[PDB]
Design an enzyme around this catalytic site. Sequence first.
Site, PDB file in Angstrom:
ATOM      1  N   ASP A 162       0.825  -1.198   0.000  1.00 32.87           N
ATOM      2  CA  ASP A 162       0.000   0.000   0.000  1.00 32.87           C
ATOM      3  C   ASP A 162       0.866   1.258   0.000  1.00 32.87           C
ATOM      4  O   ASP A 162       1.346   1.680   1.052  1.00 32.87           O
ATOM      5  CB  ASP A 162      -0.881  -0.023   1.249  1.00 32.87           C
ATOM      6  CG  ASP A 162      -1.786   1.171   1.358  1.00 32.87           C
ATOM      7  OD1 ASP A 162      -1.911   1.916   0.362  1.00 32.87           O
ATOM      8  OD2 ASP A 162      -2.387   1.355   2.446  1.00 32.87           O
ATOM      9  N   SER A 200      -0.566  15.470 -12.189  1.00 37.31           N
ATOM     10  CA  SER A 200      -0.815  15.091 -13.567  1.00 37.31           C
ATOM     11  C   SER A 200      -1.050  16.337 -14.408  1.00 37.31           C
ATOM     12  O   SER A 200      -1.581  17.337 -13.930  1.00 37.31           O
ATOM     13  CB  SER A 200      -2.031  14.161 -13.642  1.00 37.31           C
ATOM     14  OG  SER A 200      -2.412  13.868 -14.976  1.00 37.31           O
TER      15      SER A 200
END
EC number: 3.4.23.22
Length: 330
Positions: free
Chosen positions: A35, A199
């Site tokens: 994770d 992004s």
Amino acid sequence: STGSATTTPIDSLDDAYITPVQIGTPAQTLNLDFDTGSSDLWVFSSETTASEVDGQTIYTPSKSTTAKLLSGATWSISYGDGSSSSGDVYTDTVSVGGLTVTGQAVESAKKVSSSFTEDSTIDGLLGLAFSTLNTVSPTQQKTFFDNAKASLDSPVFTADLGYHAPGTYNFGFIDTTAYTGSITYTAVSTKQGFWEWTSTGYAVGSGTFKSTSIDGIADTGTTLLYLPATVVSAYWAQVSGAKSSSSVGGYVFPCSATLPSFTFGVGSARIVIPGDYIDFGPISTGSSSCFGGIQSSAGIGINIFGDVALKAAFVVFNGATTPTLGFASK
């Protein structure tokens, strides 16, 4: 040193991935959920409330000659889906894919929430976010990667998750045969303890690319792709009959649909998520309404590039002095 381990979907939808981890002496192998959105390595154990164990493999520290109680240490964690676990702490030898850390904090669960009990396939979590998020008190502990880093050939790990198939976590090296083209690296902020990056935009299907900054986290421990409501609405508008359902808890679509791809930007590069990766199947057994793999982050408070996005790429988690993230197509 290096390590290399195969990671395997827990079910036919890729809801999560499990990776075998050796703990203790002799080794006890548990299947953990790696994770990159948290920083605790915790396991089902011989200390876990008996009624809360249902099929998981447990760690029994009393059977490990290298286990030592970390005196006075406790831990307690809650995840974004409302699940939780807590307990006490041992140090022990932990190996992943041939890479060994001695003195790793292994957080032994005394209590787990129902969702963990009900999932027999996940024996615990292995956190790979920054150690500043580790919950051990009163002395915060380091992640497996943080402990291994100085010994690694290069201070990196990579995630290469499969679509409806196994994939690989590598530690200490970049497998140049595992991706196509080049890896594009992008800046990371560690201010919130995550692999947080920005992004450069998105496209839906064959549509034009929209240049827009989307700050979010690379999180192997989250199943879906959570993005701003504007972006998500633009995606689902291209699927006839798709709608946001408050009762189901997100966007649903007719199971008869053919889903468009979704592209996200990494600098000037582009990662394409095929439409099929965005199908999470019937909302309940036998239903013709299917759950979407792209969902709104509104009210989560953070955008999350979870498994839906990451499995479309070869992803480098660069733990150099100034961390960065790399993405390649594959």
